[model samples]
Target: SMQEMTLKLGHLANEQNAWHLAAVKFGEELSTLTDGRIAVEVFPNESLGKEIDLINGMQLGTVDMTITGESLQNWAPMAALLAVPYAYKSLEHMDEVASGEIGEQIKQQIIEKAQVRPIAFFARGPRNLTSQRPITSPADLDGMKMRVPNVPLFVDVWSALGASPTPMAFSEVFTSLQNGVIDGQENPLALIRSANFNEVQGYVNQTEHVRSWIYLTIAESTWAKLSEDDQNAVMQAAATAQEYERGLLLESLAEDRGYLESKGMTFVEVDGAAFQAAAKDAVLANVSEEIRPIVESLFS
Candidate 1:
């Protein structure tokens, strides 16, 4: 016999975002797997709370789950492995790590420190530079004012690469770009299109600086309440959702790029090797000591 229950899953992405759709798919699959006893109610657009706040809510038993990534580093240093600039050379390389032993270690640390259990992982598009001017090499970033996620590691990496980095919320990026608050920003093509940055920015400088993945995770408190069979069912549903999301991600990558091109966003080819070499030291210096060796191993 299964107990009837509802899980609250929240995330920052909008309803149309693949992540939100995937969350919905997970909910549907879970409902089917548990014969409608286990239901997932997804609240997108931060309707539940922002990433960090939601994580705290999970710790206090207020939130059941969230889609999260590097932000976990605030509680689990090992989670920083989620995104390290130039760490994984390509999508294939990133997959090798995120699904390997190193990934398992990170998951364990997150469970212990963040009080959350990751059910499935989804690959993310690589971060790229969107600027008014083409930036083909590190030299072009000299004194450029750029917007970076409010992460110390990102700030340090951008600063070391010669740009003056300002940490800002994702919500403010488009308005800031329009008002000259930042001359440029970095994000995946999906975000570049979603945020309508093409209207304010001119060049999609191919800076593919960081490749990362985020997790579909539930609170330990919530997980403990589930029956073993329900637990297994939840994992299976999550796995299905993960595969479904990957297909969406791959399709979006090409669709978004083509859409951006149609909208007149010029894509520039950057000197990736040069940017990688320049950012290596900053990454090593900024990441916590707990993940330093792991980061180094990736570099080597």
Candidate 2:
């Protein structure tokens, strides 16, 4: 019981979000399990460092912990499976995959290639499209100009669906929509509401185009320094935080939708089949050959 440590956990979610709340809970559990031997210092909203920067810090043992997602695909392949358009049928399906055999492989790959170890994973909000009009089908896109994050897969898929997709930094999205530089944008309900996008956009099309999960990971060097008993304690605390975050995610999703609606933003029901059909070819083309077959199987 002599392994005293203070872990630094940094991430991009705001103080009010489930991730931050769960992070606090993780710290509580860790302290309880370790009899105050392990302390967690959480920095929310990238107050410590940005996502990529945090990962880089972890690789060098300069940072202790963070929550991260598919961006890991740059270093490991299976990491991309989470956000492939229309891949997992529902949240339950995504969980099965992330908690199953493939998830084990992704975890190992991240440890080996990214030099970070995933102790637990949290489900992500499903990504949806917001625009001036209700876009129920691909045809409704009608060459509508839309803003996408600087991700080639998003650009290719939106283009295939008939939108003129423009890749830009998320920091620039609000001003772009206001200046008529972009007619539409896509994000989860929470982000749209937090950004007050309802002021510029009228409808939230429930495309649910991309869904993913993120890992509560620590630097491999940090993990290596842990005693065997402390390592088990870390896992126990992570599991508690993971379960806590799931309940928060489900509750907050309904509230996010309700809040956006109260702001006069209509939620449109999308023709999912049509959109999926339109995006299939482009997704296959954009994903790496290493993961293409798995994506193809999921599409089927």
Candidate 3:
């Protein structure tokens, strides 16, 4: 018999975000599959909690599900593979590895170590640099300062590319760019548009530097309470949700760029080969040794 439950799926995405939309899709599919015995209530914008806080709530059986990734590296080092700069050259390359043997290894580790189960993964728009002027190569950097996440890996990776990279709170980024506290920053196009960065920055230098994915995951405790048939339903619904979210991202990728340009920002294509050559050394050095070989193989 299917368990009678309403899982609370919480995430950081706003209501407009693709992750929120897909979470609702998964809920509807699961409700149909189980005749309403299983359900999901989505709380976007961290109505439940921030990502790391929700993750802790999962381990305590207080939260049912969330969309998360990379941070899992705190417990499962292999999860770090999710966002290694320039490792997966394009969306196609990222998908191959995410659905392949390496994917299985990382999944198993998360279940074993973090006690959370990944049901499906959604692609994030690649992060690109936004600057006042176009920059296509490391030679163009010229010690121009940029904002990076506080993470050491991101700091190291950007530095390898010859920019003066500094870590700062994302909340400070727009004002920083506004007042020239920083010269440039990097993020997905959606963020560039939403944050109104087009007003301060004029060019979207398409470095496509960090291609990544995040997972829709259930708490293992909550999962184990489900009957085997309901578990299948969960997986099937998650698969459907993943596809739905991918379409949103693929659609948004173009729309976001178009919107930014309409606001008078220029789009500059980069020589990715030069960037990869410069940054891979830092990528390999900063990630834990356990996954260093995998990173090396991906670089090739």
lDDT of prediction 1: 0.89
Predicted structure with the largest lDDT when compared to the true one: 1
lDDT tens per residue, model 2, 1-300: 664789999986667778899999999999999999999999986778867778899998889999887767767767877678888877798899899988898899999999999999988788999998889999998999999764567877899889999976454677899999899999888668656788899999999988878899999999999999999999999999999999998989779888888999998999988987777877987888877888888887
Model 2 is weakest, by summed lDDT over 10 consecutive residues, at: 167-176
Span of ten consecutive residues with least summed lDDT in model 3 = 148-157
Tell how far residue 2 is off in model 2, in angstroms: 8.8
Residue 125 lDDT (model 3) = 86
Best-to-worst order by TM-score is 1, 2, 3
How displaced is residue 5 in candidate 3, in Å?
2.9
| C-alpha lDDT of all candidate models, in order | 0.89, 0.86, 0.86
Rank the models by lDDT, top first: 1, 2, 3
CA deviation > 4 Å runs, candidate 3: 1-3, 132-152, 162-184, 194-201
Query: How close to the true structure is residue 236 of candidate 2, measured as C-alpha lDDT?
Result: 99
Q: Estimate each model's TM-score.
A: 0.92, 0.88, 0.84
Q: What are the clashing pairs of model 2?
A: none
Candidate whose TM-score is highest: 1
Error of 1 at 135 (Å): 2.2
Report the candidate with higher TM-score, 1 versus 3: 1
